Structure formats: C-alpha cells, structure tokens
Amino acid sequence: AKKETIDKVSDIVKEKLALGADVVVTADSEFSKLGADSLDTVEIVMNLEEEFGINVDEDKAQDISTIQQAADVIEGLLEKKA
Ligand SMILES: *OP(=O)(O)OCC(C)(C)[C@@H](O)C(=O)NCCC(=O)NCCSC(=O)CCCCCCCCC
Question: Which segments constitute the Carrier domain?
C-alpha cells in the first residue's frame, strides 16, 4: 500500500481510538498497542468498509498486525473490483 492509503486508514483509526491529537500512529504501530479493543476494533473495520466501500470478515483480517497491514489488504480488494 502507498503512503496515501496508509494515511487514510491511520487518520480514521487514530480518530476512532482517540482524538488523534495526543495519539501517534505509524505503519509499524499495532492496533492492540493503540488500545483498539473488541468494541473498537470492529468499529475500525466498519468505518473502513464504509469509507472504502468494501467488505471483509474479521477472521480474514486476522493476518493484520499493523496499520499498513490492513492497508495492503484493503488495496487488494479495491483492485479486485472494477
Ligand atoms: O471487545 P473486547 O471488550 O476487547 O473483548 C475481547 C474479548 C473478551 C472478546 C476477548 O476474548 C477477545 O479478544 N476475543 C477474540 C480473540 C481476540 O483476542 N481478538 C483480538 C482482536 S485484535 C485484531 O483483530 C487486530 C487487527 C484489527 C484490524 C481492524 C481493522 C481491519 C480492517 C481490514
């Protein structure tokens, strides 16, 4: 995934887990480290699915460990369609 796609996901996540002002997010930052809980984590994918207009199961998003990890998977879905 490019730096642009990462910024979009990071922007939404940091905002979802906090204000994003007092929180630092990186492509190497793990979702668990950010504090993303079960109630939050589900919200992260929910917003991304709506923002990116895609659909992904939580089971598949298991290989996700960092922000970019999800970014790469999402980019793949976009390429699949159209
Ligand atoms: O929701 P919470 O109160 O945290 O409940 C936790 C729970 C008690 C259910 C615990 O037993 C639990 O987590 N069970 C499920 C197994 C588990 O530990 N899952 C961890 C989820 S973390 C995860 O998936 C990290 C990546 C998240 C990616 C989200 C964005 C993906 C976009 C494609």
Answer: 3-78
